[PDB]
Each structure stands twice: as C-alpha cells, then as structure tokens.
RNA sequence: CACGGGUGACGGGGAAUCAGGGUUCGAUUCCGGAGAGGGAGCCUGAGAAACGGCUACCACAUCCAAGGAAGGCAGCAGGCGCGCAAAUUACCCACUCCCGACCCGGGGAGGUAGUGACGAAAAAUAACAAUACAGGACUCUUUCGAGGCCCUGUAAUUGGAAUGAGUCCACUUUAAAUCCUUUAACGAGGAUCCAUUGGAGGGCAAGUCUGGUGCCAGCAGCCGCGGUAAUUCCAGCUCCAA
C-alpha cells in the first residue's frame, strides 16, 4: 500500500546519473528503511537497486509521509566514481580507516622529530 | 531654555553639561570618589570574613536590638557591619566563616530602624541562609 | 545583649502541617478560578465579602 | 564565528500595573470562557494586536495615493480577511483600529473546535488537540494556538489515527476489553 | 576650548528603552585597527618588524651529569589564581570554504555532540457522564413547593473514555552517532505520575481567623506594627499575584 511518486526528477549528463526527491507514503506503519526504498524504485524505473543511493528521510508530524532524496546512477562504476565514501560504507561495499583522528595527529609530530627515512620506523 | 538662537547649540549643550553636575544622580555616577568609597566597587555581591558579631541598638520610637555581623572583605580588605537578614539566624552564623554579602535594597542609604547598615548576608559557607531557615539545608560541621 | 537570639522562634509551639487534597493545576486552576468568581455569584445587596474575609 | 540566528524575541508584554482590580477582571473573563492556560498568552495576543494597530496608525498618517500606503495597506488587508477576522466588504485600513482582542480568539483552533461543536467542553477541546485526535487538511495539529485561516476553516475534522474518529481504539479501551475478555476466558 | 589631564574609552554597523523628542550601552560573531609576557632589532618572503620565526635585555618558569640546553595557551580543550561571575583535557573533516605539487593529503578554522533554569519560542501537571445538593431563565401557587422542555456550579460519591513523562523495539537521523518525528507493546480515578516562588494594614490583589510571643524576638523598600485581645513578629487554616 506504499506508493512512491516522482518529484524534482531530472537527468544528469554532467554527473552521469539521475536525481529526484523521493516521496514515501506509509500511513499507519513505521518509517520504511532506506533498503526497502531501493528495490521499489528499481522495479518502477526497471533498473538495478545497487546503483540506487537514497537517503535524507525525515518524517512529517502525524505520520503517513516522509520526504527523502536520492540519486540513480547509470552504471555501478559511475556509482563509485563521484560519490562520498561514507555512502559507499552505508551499503557495506567500502571499508574506511578505523584509526581515530587524534591518534593520526599523535604520530604526525613524532615523525617530525626524526629527519630522514626513519619516519616510518617511528610509527608502530 | 532661555536663549533661542539659530546657532546657540554650543551654548545650550554647555549649559546642559554644566547643570548636569549639579544633579545628585549624575554627579554620583560620573565621579571616581563615589566608586572609591563604595566597598563593593560596583559589585552586586561580595564575599567577606566574619571576625565578630555586633549588636546594634535601634532608633526612635521603635526600639529593639538588631543582630549584625562585622564582615571583612577579601577583595578590598575593608570592614562592613552587615545585617543578619531573618529572625533567629545568628545561631546559624559562626566565627571565621565566609559570607556572601550584598546590599539590602536602598542603594547606599541606611534602612529603617538600623542606623548605618546597608548590607545583608545571603549565603554562609557556600550554603544559602534562606534554606537554613527553611531547614532544606544543614551546615557541614 | 546578644544572648536572646531565636528567643521566640524556639518557644513557639510546633504545629505539624495537616494533609489536604492537592490543588488542581495548569489551566484547570484558572478554570476553577473563573467559574466561582463570575458565573456562580448571585445579585445580593450589601457589602461583597472577600474570598478570605471571616469575622 | 558561527552561522546561526542569535534572534531572541518576546511574544508578550507585561502590563505596567500588576495589581489593579479592573485588569484582573477582564483577563479572567478571557481565560475561562475560551479555555486559556495563563495570563501570559493573554498578553501574547495583545502584543500581536499592538503590532497591527501601530502599523495601521502610521499608514493613516501617510497621505492618500502614497505608494507605500497603497502597497503596505493592501498587503496588510490581505492577511486580515484570509484569517476570517475582517469582513471582505469591510476591507479598509481604518477599521483596523476598531478591531478588538475579542475577535482574534475565535480563530484560535482550540475555540474553533468548540465552535464546530465536536468537543463537549472548551477545556475538553484543548485535550483533543493535545491527544492528537483531530487534523486540519490531513495534518495533525497538537497545539491549541493554531491560527485557522478563512479558507482552511471547513477542513477541520478528526484525524485518521484517532479512536474518537475512524481509527484504532485507545489504551483504556484496549485495557478494558482485554480484562473483560480475560475474565471470561 | 588650543595645549594638557582623566577615561571603569578599540571605533562603527548596531542593542535596550522610549507617544514626540532623548538616555544608557556596544569586550562579543560583520568591517577596519592593535598584540601574542614587556620593550627593541632583524633573516626569508611579493606581502611580517611575524612571535604555533629568530636575535638580545627585563620579569617568570624548566631539565641538568653543574659542563650546558631549552619556553611563551589574549589559538581548541584543560589546570591554578582572581573573583558575585562564566562549560568537555569529547568526536569528525560528513556541511561551509581555505591551503598545497593537488579530483586523492591537511584544517581544535569549522561542523557535530556533552555541561549548561544566561536567555527566547511552543507547551504537560487532566476531560466527560451519572447520584445527592446550592441554585439560575419558565407555568401554577398572594407565599410554601413542584417538572426540569434549557441548564451552571460544588462534593477522596461512582463510572469508564483519551493521551503523555518514563520503560521501550524497528526505521529514520548522522562521518558514526545523539535529539525530534513515525512505529509496535506497556504506561494514570487521592489519574501519590502530588508546582513551586512571594504576600495577605495602606501603595497593592488578598482573614480584623486560631494559638504562642509581650517594644523581647523580630517584621517592614516607605508610612509604620510589637510594651498581654499583634488584621504587620513565630507557627496552623484560609486566601491573593505569576
């Protein structure tokens, strides 16, 4: 009973994708996940859900409607060319560094103490 | 104004500048002597050290004994005969204890039956005296 | 002298505070106040008695 | 430096006299009859009327055919009719001064709920808004101080998710029916 | 009104406050100036008299093997002192842009959270119905009293109806979170899931109520109360203002 319609739809040849505002109607139930959105847009636009990156969901007061925004890529390699790394980690296909920012600052000045090749020996 | 010339602005402004110094409120707020003689120095509240408790005799017809405390400051070193605000609160105050002293509300003028005191105690030993009267707080001993 | 501090407060006889129904609060406090001032009164001659006036 | 508002503004003005008998009679009439909560929002509607009254007065001082008066006069009268306070045949800047504080209080949604007759009490009307049982143009309003527009007046009804309307029963009905069935087995 | 002195004077755009005019403030996010403990001098660089650059003196402070070496948080945190007075030694470059040889690296700039009754905006702490009653517009009754076509309120009298605060999952949110919103389930009849702060002679709304106190304690911004019937002190009831 969840119907998805098209708002602010326009193609991108400068950016090799599509983009539109996703309007989701789910009255009487919870906010559907971003994963659930992907195949519903995949079937109605007849594409694969792996090139579907949809986010930015905020529920209106009273329920029944959430406003979201997403991009449709032309191909999977385009989806990894021009995209922030965190959204690639949102779907689990990218694993970023887990080293804290403070620790990255700790060995930076310690490598400054040693002039020469032995900067790499200071780190760990 | 008396003179009504079209270019007497410097005459009118100088008269208003000079006659303002004859006003009690303007001269008090624009002289260093008024702030020099104030033990607070423009401060709303201040902390002081109790060195003794002083009983102050009352004025004309209404006659009683008012309980006061000789408060010695830490920021200036001056001594203030501050008044203990409420009834039966001199048992709460002890010797050599820091007290938060403010004014009483008349802004530099002796208030009512008490002669020569403009100051009241708010907090004692970082504990509010109002809660001591209400029993909401107990003095650490 | 300074010995008679807390003279009366010490010797005043202690009454423990008795229990009563908690007052209706919020807009219900003003709802209760509105009716018994305006609509519940009747036209009577003489001095209007105060809310706390007892003789 | 941060990029934000730093705009704090009071929505009400306290009276100059606190303790007069005449003002205490007048505002207490306005609270109980329309189900208000405190004297603060009483002063809060008066402060909004003071802005409209002062904006109208400076337009009367301006001469006729003043393009500032022509544009601001028409823009101010556009908003007055569309909230259902000023008649469309009374559209003129000089009857703004004759507008009282008694007229604004119907267009509050708490009073409009009683005026439409779907609440038993004016104070019960505030409970229905608080418990999200009603909606305006398919949008639930939880606040009684909603300003109902003239064109949005006829769309006020119960919300879809409301036991008083066409929705699921509340907690008490689920509590009473479960033990009624639980007692019977 | 020169010169000089003080300035508890960084200046302005502006802030509070006003019918009209004015008064006070502007350390504080934007612009411009000055500085990195106080001076002074300089290297490089297009641009510095730079101090998250040197060179000396002054004051403070550090390690020392006693030979010597080395420092500037009015940068974000944080610690001491000073005070009446002011937060975390948190996370992240995901937004804004900036810098570099640069699509890629870096940014305590900045963003996100924590403390936080500075303050501002919205807004809980209840609502309905029935029984006794105190009664209100009507008809009869010269009064008494009646039915309630219409109601108004009171009473730990009774009854169910609806939600939040909190418990609480799914999703969303976000760099990862968090908050809000949606979503299930619970969750209130003294809905103990209990609202406090001042005052009750006048200004100034609200007891000539009760007891104790007896010019004592004390109250009181002011007028004034208290000396044995205190409408003013201390308690209780009640009431009044937000």
From Swiss-Prot, chain B:
Gene (UniProt): RPS23
Molecular function, one GO term: structural constituent of ribosome
The organism of origin for this protein: Oryctolagus cuniculus
Protein name (Swiss-Prot/TrEMBL): Small ribosomal subunit protein uS12
Record location of the Glycyl lysine isopeptide (Lys-Gly) (interchain with G-Cter in SUMO2) cross-link: 36
Bias-annotated ranges (Basic residues): 1-19
Residue list for modification N6-succinyllysine: 53
Positions of post-translational N6-acetyllysine modification: 134
InterPro entries: NA-bd_OB-fold, Ribosomal_uS12, Ribosomal_uS12_euk/arc
Similarity-based family: Belongs to the universal ribosomal protein uS12 family.
Localisation per UniProt entry: Cytoplasm, Cytosol; Cytoplasm; Rough endoplasmic reticulum; Nucleus, Nucleolus
Swiss-Prot record, chain C:
Modified residues (N6-succinyllysine): 47
Residues annotated as signal peptide: none
Intracellular or extracellular location(s): Cytoplasm; Nucleus
Disulfide bonds: none
Top-level taxon: Eukaryota
Protein role: Component of the 40S subunit of the ribosome. Contributes to the assembly and function of 40S ribosomal subunits.
Subunit details: Component of the 40S subunit of the ribosome.
Protein name: Small ribosomal subunit protein eS30
Protein's organism: Oryctolagus cuniculus (Rabbit)
Species lineage: Eukaryota, Metazoa, Chordata, Craniata, Vertebrata
Gene: FAU
Residue window of the full protein shown: 79 to 133 of 133
Swiss-Prot record, chain D:
Modification sites for Phosphoserine: 152, 162
Residues in S4 RNA-binding domain copies: 107-181
MF GO annotations: rRNA binding; structural constituent of ribosome
Any one GO cellular component localisation term in the record: cytosolic small ribosomal subunit
Residues annotated with N6-acetyllysine modification: 65, 115, 154
Coiled coil (residue ranges): none
Keyword GTP-binding appears in the UniProt entry: no
Stretch forming the signal peptide: none
Spans annotated as Disordered: 161-185
UniProt name for this protein: Small ribosomal subunit protein uS4
Organism: Oryctolagus cuniculus
Designated gene of the protein: RPS9
